[PDB]
Write a protein that binds this ligand. Structure first.
Ligand code: RET
Ligand code: RET
Ligand code: RET
Lengths: 216, 216, 216
């Protein structure tokens, strides 16, 4: 359609949907409560993302934000997506290592500030302030990674580093993309987030559910 | 007032308020933690709905959505209502049959997508796409009913079928009402949702709390 | 800047940030899961508030609401703040006295209606109706205080009365401030909420975390 990035949105929609179907079928039959837990969590994340990519695709999860003298398309549904899926992803790690509740709360808590401040950064009309919110969000992401390292083992370790490399990519792509300094066109900005999202929402899950660590 | 549907909104407000008072008084004295749980859950649901019908009544939870060439009044507060009460209703069943946590999460998870996609459907300006969101929401509702059947007993069974007949009514009324194909005037569309809501928010609760199944 | 209340917003930002840092450092080393719980909860609350005061300061969490024939600046981010921090504050008391789950739910449930109805009151364009929402919110606050009194001991008692005096201040300041009857200028309205917020978000926490009651 009229938006260059549409094919990336259409591809992410498709891959999230297929990933959703795949885990739904994969999950059928699980009777082990613990495994049930990782299956629910892991199936729900691309289901949520599927509906969010579709709203972006259909143009509903998109808005225009004025700044830098320009009218700027902002996909707010990306953040609405992360707002619900990043805490579940952290839930999978939590459950893996059996984190106690104060840690889980701090994690989930830091994550909501991460995405909420980043959504504020996204919608802020004062150009310079957007980077203030990028900074606080990035600070929160770093606390989350800090806990992950200093706050099953082998699978945990695997998903941990996947997480590091994947989650730390989101900050840069924000910065260089159209929501930030405006280094890379929106069209390529959407492509990168799609590739991260699918790796984080489907790839991560394939890696976790194919492991016996999820089993009591 | 100026809106035909006002008397239905005023009636739902009144019935939810009275239902709220009734359970609040009913609940006083409960010392059994488990029963306490069903009382809180069941009292909270019409309290939330009371405030939401009032915002609709007062006109705050109402907006106009353009599509089909027309400006269309949409009661978004209906969805804000279901967003918080449908998961608690599912909580009551969950607690009844002592569902494990992976099931509860999948249930609560599918329910949030159900109402969120249906709210997107409600606010979408592209006529044809609204039905796409109706379809995904309906798909999620069907997963929720699927779990309910394939995922205390007697009371469970009773509330289960009440749930089936009541929840499956919401899809049709969306379709034929003004938010969809536009078969039934808004005025009658509001009347039907009010009747469902009160049966689902008060009737359901009367049935559950009058049972000893809620007792350890 | 152009807004008189800015210095109060800047002061609250600063005090919440410093309070956040202070507990973060204070919390380092805690290994006792229960204590971990009060530390997470208590550190998260001014972190959330920090980001919300900053959005108010920067002007992002501010909007204009028409009523009384005038265009009226409303800091909606104040409510977005309370929406997440008041339930955690109640969590600290809950955990103190080891409230059972039906109580916690009723508490958290009444609190969300409290702030949500008060946010509706804040954004309502019909002058007289704002006070209807003030009334329902106040009713919910009273239920929350009722439970607190009729629904560790010594610390509980201390935080309980702090809570009473602090939380009951918010209703009056709404009433006399610019969001209500318009008795006190916005500039002083913001000052009072800042003083309450910092006492409720930092002061309360200093009092709780300096106690051994948080320890198993
Ligand atoms: C959809 C799955 C995941 C794993 C998404 C993770 C996204 C983030 C870690 C985003 C972080 C951001 C930061 C650190 C600062 C700028 C705003 C963002 C929200 C993009
Ligand atoms: C207030 C109480 C209940 C039991 C409400 C239940 C509502 C639904 C099951 C709504 C479902 C919808 C579907 C399936 C698709 C169109 C949009 C709706 C949200 C109306
Ligand atoms: C930030 C910390 C706390 C302890 C804030 C508490 C705020 C309230 C108790 C607010 C209550 C309100 C009432 C009772 C009615 C009018 C609207 C308010 C939301 C201000």
């Amino acid at each position: 359609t009229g938006r260059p990035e549409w094919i990336w949105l259409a591809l992410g929609t498709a891959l999230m949907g297929l990933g959703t179907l795949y885990f739904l079928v994969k999950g059928m039959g699980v009777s082990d409560p613990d495994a049930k837990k990782f299956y629910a969590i892991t199936t729900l994340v691309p289901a949520i993302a599927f509906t969010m990519y579709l709203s972006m695709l259909l143009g509903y999860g998109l808005t225009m934000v004025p700044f830098g003298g320009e009218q700027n398309p902002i996909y707010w549904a990306r953040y609405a997506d992360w707002l619900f899926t990043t805490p579940l992803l952290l839930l999978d790690l939590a459950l893996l290592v059996d984190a106690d509740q104060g840690t889980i709360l701090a994690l989930v808590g830091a994550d909501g500030i991460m995405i909420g401040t980043g959504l504020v950064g996204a919608l802020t009309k004062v150009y310079s302030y957007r980077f203030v919110w990028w900074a606080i969000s990035t600070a929160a992401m770093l606390y989350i990674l800090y806990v992950l390292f200093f706050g099953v083992a082998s699978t945990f370790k695997v998903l941990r580093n996947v997480t590091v490399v994947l989650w730390s990519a989101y900050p840069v792509v924000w910065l260089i993309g159209s929501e930030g300094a405006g280094i890379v066109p929106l069209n390529i900005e959407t492509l990168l987030f799609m590739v991260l999202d699918v790796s984080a929402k489907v790839g991560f899950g394939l890696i976790l559910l194919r492991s016996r660590a999820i089993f009591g």
